[PDB]
Scaffold this active site. Structure first.
Site, short mmCIF file in Angstrom:
data_model
loop_
_atom_site.label_atom_id
_atom_site.label_comp_id
_atom_site.label_asym_id
_atom_site.label_seq_id
_atom_site.Cartn_x
_atom_site.Cartn_y
_atom_site.Cartn_z
N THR A 1 34.07 28.34 -0.86
CA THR A 1 32.53 28.07 -0.72
C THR A 1 31.75 26.90 -1.52
O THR A 1 30.78 26.55 -0.93
CB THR A 1 31.91 29.62 -0.93
OG1 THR A 1 32.38 30.44 0.17
CG2 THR A 1 30.35 29.49 -0.87
N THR B 1 35.99 31.99 -4.10
CA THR B 1 35.71 32.85 -5.21
C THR B 1 36.65 34.12 -4.92
O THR B 1 36.96 34.79 -5.96
CB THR B 1 34.22 33.48 -5.34
OG1 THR B 1 33.87 33.78 -3.86
CG2 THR B 1 33.30 32.33 -5.64
N1 LIG Z 1 36.04 32.92 1.41
C1 LIG Z 1 35.56 31.78 0.40
C2 LIG Z 1 34.47 32.63 -0.44
C3 LIG Z 1 33.82 32.00 -1.82
O1 LIG Z 1 34.47 30.86 -1.99
O2 LIG Z 1 32.74 32.43 -2.07
C4 LIG Z 1 36.69 31.46 -0.42
O3 LIG Z 1 37.27 32.36 -1.48
O4 LIG Z 1 37.03 30.32 -0.37
#
Ligand SMILES: N[C@@H](CC(=O)O)C(=O)O
Ligand SMILES: N[C@@H](CC(=O)O)C(=O)O
Ligand SMILES: N[C@@H](CC(=O)O)C(=O)O
Ligand SMILES: N[C@@H](CC(=O)O)C(=O)O
Lengths: 316, 318, 317, 318
Positions: A12, A79
């Site tokens: 993200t 995340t």
């Molecule tokens: N689905 C994303 C979520 C995030 O980055 O907040 C990832 O882990 O790449």
């Protein structure tokens, strides 16, 4: 100024569409605090990460830790499995050089996007002498969190990342403020080294809940698992229905590792809910099921002895 | 004095788990006689991590008979902590009564130093005897708190404060008295569309976990063993690996409900159409409910409907 | 679209408290998608320096906007330091079902990753939402819907600064409101209190308990006009040996004695447990932290001087 | 077996508060004999909310003589919960010993149902006896946790989880065994520059609260009645009302130290020069320390220095 490399992997923080060069341009203040340079190691949504991806990232990190041109390393990441990568690097990267893993809960295009300050703070910490020898760090929500036991515990909000043992510090206006040090083995005092690691053994996770059956445990072992993380109820508790399948899987050579879905505090105690000594099982101590999977994978590059796996769950 | 019935099911609260009978549980707390007229029944004697769907149905049926009896004002269920949150939610969905239903366990057996069981049971009886508990839905009374049976969860191991909700305790119980600070906003008991009087059986629902390098293996095996819904205990916002999406699309084509929960259990919720195109895939998000809670609601719900839009509505209202 | 008025009062949300309400609004153009928004500058203060007269002015303006047919919802932009005092005060005295939302930011819009933009968006979204009617005063920071009654500034520096011992009642995500709990305590329409009737608040001060504390702050505060002292006690509103005589004589001379605590993450102060409140004619502040208990002690004493009625109030609001 | 001495001072842990002698505390935990050679001493018998600076000096001198004794391996202080956190931080600053020092209390007296004192006392002795505790600074052992005496605080009323730190528990104690997950980062015990052997009295330090419509009265009366430092328990990041700044400039001008703490106590800290111009005013920020903890550190610092710059170093290292 310190020399920091940013290894981008997606997430993200890169909404996984931006390349590391636009991430760096996005935070012009980085040049006030470090000589930064970026690489694009990969561009993934971290829920889709592979063991191949970790090995590539870990080898590349080691190569940079061995360069005298690199004072600290920042990894931009999704995340969703940030906690798993952070812990992996903590076990295998034998260096006092600061390693910071950082994500964001919102894309840089959203109102009040958290990425810009998260990335500023990851470089500041990657540049700080206080970070050297602290093991892998995660710098979100103005906190310095241990890469060992920080976990994505809250959805949507920017305070997503929590440890049961508390933040170790905070970072505010680029300054690092320490309140605790690590007590578990990491990086320089680890017995594991990505340099001696060419492949990772297959470790899967099965969920414990009322009326659960042995189906997932059997199917995952038939499809390659060398260890099963049991995400049990309470204190790694195992249904009287499933215990015989776990016995049979252990005799069959599958390590049985008793974690829990009780993740805000406490830990799984050997021999409390199950006769681990008698069954030749292991307890994952305080480690949540996805953390236990990583420590299990890394440990089984070095040993298949349930006694040594227990020591390793008690030391890392 | 209210008429409170104690239904005993086992657990550490009856430990030396699940070794003392309800009459010794009650005899261990002589102060109960001051706050209510109690009698005990042994419904079963189990370690709650070993509960079956058959035991759950049996408990929901017996609670229903006591609730419609005129000599019963309140019901306390003594229970193991490990799946206390599953049983509490189940009762919250299926017991169409206004009478207090309290579920209570202990983290320490009654023989241990500073055992938490005696005050927990005293508090459960106090709460079930209290006119303030009426119509509040299923409650859990551990650590001096009044917690909603809907979203309270065993979140801390070992410690007596084991049970938390993301949305806080609704109250406290202190020296027998209840103090309320919040009220439930989600449907329960009297206002539920579900009823144990019409439920004799539950569809098979199973859970699979999300993590790095995960495969479609558990989902396919669980569906081959009879699962009618799979709870996906995803990373982050119910996120699904690219390597797993193909199998969930096939399984949905095959009539298996796909419900995206998560292992991000301290706060927030899983948002429809954010991490995956749920409308496109005809999947359900589990909102704030953790994987084991989502299982209980999925299987109560599918006694009534297989329409994924109705199941989403249920996950948004309960 | 809902008609929402923003009353600007200052705070870091307006930092560079240096920005007019017209700039705050322009700095969130997305507000045009979710409501018809108008701004007024009630005052331009750092909320640590707020007065009783700021509170009444803000409250009286809120009551006028609530009575108007052209206002669906109200947002107050506010410094975070006393946001929790203003939000509780409004929850006690505004007799309206119309949504009232109090909002600040922990970082100025000038900072990297400033939280004020989404906070104001969220505050307008929630003030616009029928779900907010009848809920009492709300605070909308950190993607949460918090009760103005018991939300408190509990964490410094970080954007999750606001916590309640009783948890968030909801969240606000992409302008939508998701509710998980309802208020239990008397607020707004069901309050016996009304800002219409209030001209001036009684003087109420706060003194801290700690090791080797004396009766000095308590006597000096009453000597300078306190009609009620909020004791911020150790533990369960506990009072030193050394302080109990001075509090008895203050009570005897007509000063209300309210036992709060600096134990703020949960629990509450129990009447007659650490001190014999019935014998001394004192009051316990229940769960309410000292600054919260001061707000409620001011409002309560615009109606009554009877310690038993004050205790009933501290049990109901 | 380790030699452990219990210094008893009162509290709920000795309630029928502060009514049972140390012998009765020992007798009510017969299992202590299994884990240590235990001996006691009644230092004082108080409700900890009534504690004095004299009480603290006498307790710190007792702890020091015992730590100097070669026949003592660890020390446990039984204490009221109300000011437990102040005593613990005091000892962590002034006791120059690697020998384990544990402060413990209870939220319920030993006569209550599910009283917490017996296990808390057992755990304090277990930790006081453990080689892992040496060098760790002063510890608090309540709720199965090992907390730093530096920054643990009574944060929750009524419940047995009363004691929390912004920086988390360091470890846990379970069936008498210690499990560590963090170490201290701040100066304590052996690496403290402060020493009870050199301290015969404590300067007077007082505390005043910030809130809406606050005036300078409390600050002026407390200084008029002897305070040498004022701990400002501000809103937010140690914020000071403009009605009060002038009064504090005057008091600092007249030699009274002004230390900006806050009633924002679950996390973060008070940042120098952010909310007030501390360099220009010659003020000190308490960093992460809550007002009662700031007072303890001020008092002890003010026995070795009146230099506001040295005090700020001390607020940053301890
Ligand atoms: N689905 C994303 C979520 C995030 O980055 O907040 C990832 O882990 O790449
Ligand atoms: N395994 C036990 C644990 C407990 O009761 O605390 C049970 O759930 O029955
Ligand atoms: N001191 C500022 C703090 C903030 O608004 O964040 C105020 O309360 O006005
Ligand atoms: N008032 C008692 C409370 C306790 O010990 O829990 C004290 O501090 O002495």
């Amino acid at each position: 100024l310190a020399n920091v490399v940013i290894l981008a992997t997606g997430g993200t923080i890169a909404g996984a569409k931006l390349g590391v060069d636009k991430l760096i341009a996005g935070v012009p203040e980085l040049a006030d605090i470090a000589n930064v340079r970026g690489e694009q190691v990969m561009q993934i949504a971290s829920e889709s990460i592979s063991n191949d991806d970790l090995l590539k990232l870990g080898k590349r990190v080691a190569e940079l830790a061995e360069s005298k041109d690199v004072d600290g390393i920042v990894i931009t990441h999704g995340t969703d499995t940030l906690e798993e990568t952070a812990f992996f690097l903590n076990l295998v990267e034998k260096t006092d050089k600061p390693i910071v893993v950082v994500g964001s809960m919102r894309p840089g295009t959203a109102m009040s996007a958290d990425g810009m300050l998260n990335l500023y703070n990851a470089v500041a910490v990657a540049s700080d002498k206080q970070s050297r020898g602290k093991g892998v760090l995660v710098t979100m929500n103005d906190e310095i969190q241990s890469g060992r036991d920080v976990s994505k515990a809250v959805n949507i909000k920017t305070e997503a990342f929590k440890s049961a043992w508390g933040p170790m510090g905070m970072v505010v206006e680029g300054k690092s403020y320490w309140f605790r040090l690590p007590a578990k083995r990491h990086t320089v005092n680890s017995e594991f080294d990505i340099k001696q690691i060419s492949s990772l053994p297959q470790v899967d996770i099965a969920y414990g809940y009322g009326n659960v059956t042995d189906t997932a445990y059997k199917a995952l072992a038939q499809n390659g698992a060398k260890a099963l993380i049991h995400a049990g109820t309470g204190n790694g508790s195992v249904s009287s229905r499933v215990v015989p399948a776990l016995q049979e899987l252990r005799k069959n050579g599958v390590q049985i590792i008793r974690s829990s879905h009780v993740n805000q505090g406490g830990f799984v105690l050997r021999n409390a809910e199950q006769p681990d000594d008698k069954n030749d099982w292991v307890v994952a101590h305080d480690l949540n099921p996805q953390k236990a999977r990583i420590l299990a994978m890394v440990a089984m590059t070095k040993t298949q002895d349930s006694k040594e796996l227990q020591r390793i769950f008690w030391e890392y």
